[PDB]
Design a binder for these strands. Sequence first.
DNA 1: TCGAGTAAGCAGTCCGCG
DNA 2: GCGGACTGCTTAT
Length: 901
Amino acid sequence: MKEFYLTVEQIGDSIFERYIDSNGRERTREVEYKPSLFAHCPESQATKYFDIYGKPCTRKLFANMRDASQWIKRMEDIGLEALGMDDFKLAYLSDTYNYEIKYDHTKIRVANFDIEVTSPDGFPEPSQAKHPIDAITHYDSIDDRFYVFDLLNSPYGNVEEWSIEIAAKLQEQGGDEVPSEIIDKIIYMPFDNEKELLMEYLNFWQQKTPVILTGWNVESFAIPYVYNRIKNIFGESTAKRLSPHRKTRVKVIENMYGSREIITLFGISVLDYIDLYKKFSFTNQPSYSLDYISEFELNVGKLKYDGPISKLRESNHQRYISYNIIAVYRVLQIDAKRQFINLSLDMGYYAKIQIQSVFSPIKTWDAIIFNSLKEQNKVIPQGRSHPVQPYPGAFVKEPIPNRYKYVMSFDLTSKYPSIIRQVNISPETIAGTFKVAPLHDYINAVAERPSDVYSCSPNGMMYYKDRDGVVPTEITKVFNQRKEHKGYMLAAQRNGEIIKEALHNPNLSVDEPLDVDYRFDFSDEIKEKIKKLSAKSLNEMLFRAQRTEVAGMTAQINRKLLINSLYGALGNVWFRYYDLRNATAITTFGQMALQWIERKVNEYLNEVCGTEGEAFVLYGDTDSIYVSADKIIDKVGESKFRDTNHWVDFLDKFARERMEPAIDRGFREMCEYMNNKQHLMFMDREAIAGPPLGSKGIGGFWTGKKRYALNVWDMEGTRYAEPKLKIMGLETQKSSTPKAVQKALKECIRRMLQEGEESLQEYFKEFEKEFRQLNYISIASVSSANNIAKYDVGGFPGPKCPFHIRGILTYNRAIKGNIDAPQVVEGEKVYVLPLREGNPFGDKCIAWPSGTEITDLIKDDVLHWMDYTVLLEKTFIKPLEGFTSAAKLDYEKKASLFDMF
DNA sequence: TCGAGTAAGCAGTCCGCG
DNA sequence: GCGGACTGCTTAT
Ligand SMILES: Cc1cn([C@H]2C[C@H](O)[C@@H](COP(=O)(O)OP(=O)(O)OP(=O)(O)O)O2)c(=O)[nH]c1=O
Ligand SMILES: [Ca+2]
Ligand SMILES: [Ca+2]
Ligand SMILES: [Ca+2]
Ligand SMILES: [Ca+2]
Ligand SMILES: [Ca+2]
Ligand SMILES: [Ca+2]
Ligand SMILES: [Ca+2]
Ligand SMILES: [Ca+2]
Ligand SMILES: [Ca+2]
């Protein structure tokens, strides 16, 4: 096989590399790598190396990496550019793997671990590591085994061995319900002292050294705790055995308020799953506890136990160990679904970076572009310091707040990357500038043509047209990958809807789910078989279809993120190719594109309707336009349609056969106006929305910018079995809104859009009447909590203290002394509840850590003093009032003359 | 919240507005 | 009571 790296590090003048050799075996080597850098040279000197602007360079080969680093410093002292890849390990990878890397994931050791630490006196701080590590579960992907290290004897209690027999039994048998599919994969090792546990763990680690190391909060807790505990018991040298090269660094992570330490393990790639999840899941969760995320992702029940976790080992060591094992498995289950490890490997090997650098799109793109340029013997520029400066972004149209009955939307494929490609925007393609007119003049095609030679953006920038820039070339490659995966995602989505339709008429029989590839649209034969399957088989297929859709979503949405982040990197001062001229060229072109096509669509529809100055485009934000289709429907007349699906078909056909060609003509003209390199503004129909035929539903509404709701029947060619609410920006979509209130507001919206005013009124009246019965957690607001100390003045709120911070201060006063009280953690999220006048907490609200029950001794008081009236007004009535005023509806029935009878 | 970007919404504080 | 100046937070794209 072709060789591929696992990890790479620079340690002084050596590159240390772990890799898979041509026979599929893991190897390690130390290489005295001699890096090269570059300086500009005269024309007279013959060279094969040129910088991205075509200026000749001479290659400097250094005796070692330290000499090269020192040369860079001396060049700074002289005031001359030192060109080339200054991150020498990336140059090493480029030289050693000068081909498209094909990797075999089955040869990569992926380790997933979790530790337990009993701590009677609060949270066990990893920097101190003052308490025994009393359990480690470490899953190894090559062995496919869970290795469980269990401490039986501790200063906090001696316990009996964990029983795999009890672990496997149902909870109704007094067991722990460790899933049957992993029971045979557990290798259980009890220890009568912590020193032998840790020594054995290190020997195990030496034999099965992780390449990818993951888990939940492993970077912020487990890794520093293990390292520091081992360091405390044995000394530094023993702790450094967690690194295969025996090198570690305490790394200080900081943001704007406060800093924290992590431990860099040289020769390991740590991908903490909480951080993978935050970057790649496109959620914003009220809590990031593993129990909360597991429930959300997997629909598994919370791991229940009596008493605090600090007393679980002594009271129920059996459950303690079983829950440690289950926690490790839950991360594996989340990854089986979301596939973020697969994503990280894919993108890491594509860019030729340390796999952990997938968290940094700047590093990822730096490597991709470097490797691309190096293939042509071109030399990358030196990175430079820039002051942070603002620059303009997207245009957002101010909508007229209203109900909107029939709506069709249109959206550009990968807009900003497509602009980069169309205009040919790159560091080395800048051709000059032209005299800019107001944007309005370009939008209305009255400004003089910018250039008859170069490709232009309405910010004044001109670009070469003779050859693609490196940014366009490389963004296109990742875009094409994205397009492939989006195809699989949408097919799986369409397939899911076929199965949902089939579930209306399930067959009474015993059978199996069909063995099919859900990434491809079901054939006629598969569809006929589906119509004869049982509900059980259909539901199994639906689950599999949905999992395939999720896999496609991960692959496509994060490649979209990567290419959009290349645009973003152009506006980040740490990017080697930072240039606000190019960042602004993209955003300003984007503004024009939106408003240009708004004009073109209005013009087209006014023509086919025989009107003048009528506004068909009701809204647009950044890219998409939303078009009112009322007049189109009315042109034929609602009575002509047999059912909802008939007018959806009609609008689908109208959009595709009439509107899209007009939009295409419109953008082709804009391309010629700007003299762009290639027409790539492909705006296709997105949503078709409206009320069910014959209903009193309103279809949709806008309250303002970034705030709307639509009842959608078809989305990008997926025809839903049941209509789907597309709600953007409204409180239903905000993690700060209480769970039960999201649910209620969503149902109010559903009733508004699908059923009408009377239906809304019936539901509102009931919610208002019954909501005090809702569980306190489900009606609590959520907020991130920053700068708690800044507003703490002797335990009381300082000037301008935020409401949620005031709540935390109230909580802190209430738990003074209470030893079984969780502390609110700076920068994490809290639940927040209002409190009625005269409550014993002495303030108008209280807050506590999100994802948790509030501690027992104040819970009864919070429940007794909760201000349901304020809660309802702020979280439910106020937002609903906004929805209904915008939609011109009443959520309460107003008096009429009929009341007199 | 270490990790690409800007636009813009709403909650809440403080305090003016005769 | 509502709105502007401001901080804080969270969303749309
Ligand atoms: C979602 C998102 C968009 N944008 C910008 C760049 C996008 O091209 C532009 C429009 O956003 P979108 O329409 O959400 O996405 P897209 O056009 O890139 O891809 P597609 O519609 O094919 O799924 O807004 C960002 O800069 N960052 C982001 O995270
Ligand atoms: Ca635990
Ligand atoms: Ca120490
Ligand atoms: Ca788009
Ligand atoms: Ca599309
Ligand atoms: Ca059937
Ligand atoms: Ca969009
Ligand atoms: Ca099209
Ligand atoms: Ca889309
Ligand atoms: Ca009490």
